[PDB]
């Protein structure tokens, strides 16, 4: 049926938080043969859910200064990153990426008090955390951004404390718990 | 990367079937092998445009550029030198001030244009603007297109 880059099967499911499975691009109409379709994804409150998660991941990658407007490059970075993950372990990179996004999402957050977190927001934060961590790793270092993203994803998927996303999630939850 | 399977039919005989860079380099190499083209002398020293400041850093660049011009000729029929200067344009970093567009060097273009004409591959007519292609050159481009097309295919 539909395979990413004509390669990745991406029909396999992940158990996750159930709500998170609803949010990620499990659905057939959210799947595409190569990234990017760009519908109107601000319009209604839950409209963002309908976006392909790979489209969201590339958009997050496209963020920040010099990166802005380089959508194809963000697609190339994720494609390269998927190749790297496949080499590092023979698992499907998209499935690994869903595991990393599932792992990265914070359960509680802190306010002026402490609160639970939207599953759509948890995905949005997780992708944000993983990409920001990748940028931090990239900037003025040997590792390419594709490598950093792959490395961050595998560590986050594993549930390593060396992940920037896991470390930030742990700290965010720990401070929330500390207050309440 | 080099070749992918696709379902649709293609023309299979023109530059409109060809990888531009591969074609440009191959024809430039063929032309240099033939030895019809000359650099010549002074053109080793020159700069290619003030938007660059530098030069291509390849030593076979003039032949490449000549070949690249010949491809533009196949696309655009009756074009002239000001069109060429504009074609090869880029941005120029103005120091601290913002960029503005900057032409390629006009003598190298003019020299190629003249050289191709001397070697009979193009013809300036009294009609219209500048130089268009000669049939022998077109048939050769088609033959090289055919060689590449076979080479990828099998």
């Amino acid at each position: 049926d539909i395979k990413l880059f004509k390669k990745w099967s991406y029909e396999e499911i992940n158990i996750a938080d159930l709500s998170l499975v609803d949010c990620i691009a499990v659905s057939q109409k959210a799947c595409v043969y190569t990234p990017h379709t760009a519908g109107r994804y601000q319009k209604k409150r839950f409209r963002k859910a309908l976006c392909p998660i790979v489209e969201r991941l590339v958009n997050s990658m496209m963020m920040h200064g010099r990166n802005n407007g380089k959508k194809l490059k963000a697609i190339r970075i994720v494609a390269y990153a998927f190749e790297i993950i496949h080499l590092m372990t023979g698992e499907n990179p998209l499935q690994v990426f869903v595991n990393a996004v599932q792992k990265g999402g914070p359960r509680e957050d802190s306010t002026r008090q402490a609160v639970d977190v939207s599953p759509l927001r948890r995905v949005n934060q997780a992708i944000y955390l993983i990409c920001t961590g990748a940028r931090n790793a990239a900037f003025r270092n040997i590792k390419s951004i594709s490598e950093c993203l792959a490395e961050e994803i595998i560590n986050c998927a594993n549930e390593s404390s060396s992940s920037y996303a896991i470390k930030k999630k742990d700290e965010i939850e720990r401070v929330a718990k500390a207050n309440r | 990367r080099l070749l992918e399977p696709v379902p649709f039919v293609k023309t299979n005989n023109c530059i409109k079937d060809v990888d531009a860079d591969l074609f440009i380099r191959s024809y430039a190499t063929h032309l240099k092998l033939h030895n019809k083209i000359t650099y010549p002398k002074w053109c080793t020293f020159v700069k290619t445009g003030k938007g660059r400041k530098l030069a291509p850093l390849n030593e076979d660049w003039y032949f490449i550029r000549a070949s690249s011009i010949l491809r533009r000729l196949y696309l655009h029929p009756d074009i002239g030198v000001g069109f060429l200067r504009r074609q090869f344009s880029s941005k120029q970093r103005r120091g601290v001030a913002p960029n503005h567009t900057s032409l390629a060097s006009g003598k190298i273009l003019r020299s190629i244009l003249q050289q191709l004409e001397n070697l009979g591959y193009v013809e300036q007519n009294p009609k219209k603007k500048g130089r268009r292609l000669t049939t022998k050159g077109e048939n050769a481009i088609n033959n090289f297109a055919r060689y590449i097309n076979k080479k990828v295919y099998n």
Binding site: - | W42, T44, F45, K47, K53, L54, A55, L57
Partner: protein, 128 residues
């Protein structure tokens, strides 16, 4: 052996030959590129495996442009003022000559000379 040094005791050697040469003078890099071509050495090669003869040739080309196909518009120190032409002074001699020019301007009195004496920018720093 492998990271041998360069002109006027500079320790460059894992730099590419162009990059080493530019790290003397010529770091608009057109100068280095033409010198590299006049020498006919590979610009991709690393500096510390040149023999002394290649270096001497390069120093000769840089020092004396006269017997090479280098045009006047390209040249360092293009006309040099007085009726007796001189060209391509370069390096510490250029720096010394430029100091002499600023001294000469000052003695004569020119606005630029006078500004150099004051310690003011020629193009001007503009209010601030």
């Amino acid at each position: 052996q492998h990271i041998l040094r360069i002109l006027n005791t500079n320790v460059d050697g894992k730099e590419k030959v162009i990059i080493a040469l530019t790290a003397i003078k010529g770091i608009g890099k057109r100068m280095a590129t033409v010198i590299c071509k006049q020498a006919n050495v590979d610009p991709t090669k690393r500096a510390g495996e040149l023999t002394t003869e290649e270096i001497d040739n390069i120093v000769h080309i840089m020092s004396t442009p006269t017997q090479f196909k280098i045009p006047d518009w390209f040249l360092n120190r293009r006309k040099d003022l007085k009726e007796g032409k001189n060209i391509h002074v370069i390096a510490n001699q250029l720096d010394s000559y430029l100091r002499e020019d600023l001294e000469r301007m000052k003695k004569i009195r020119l606005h630029r000379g006078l500004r150099h004496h004051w310690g003011l920018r020629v193009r001007g720093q503009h209010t601030k």
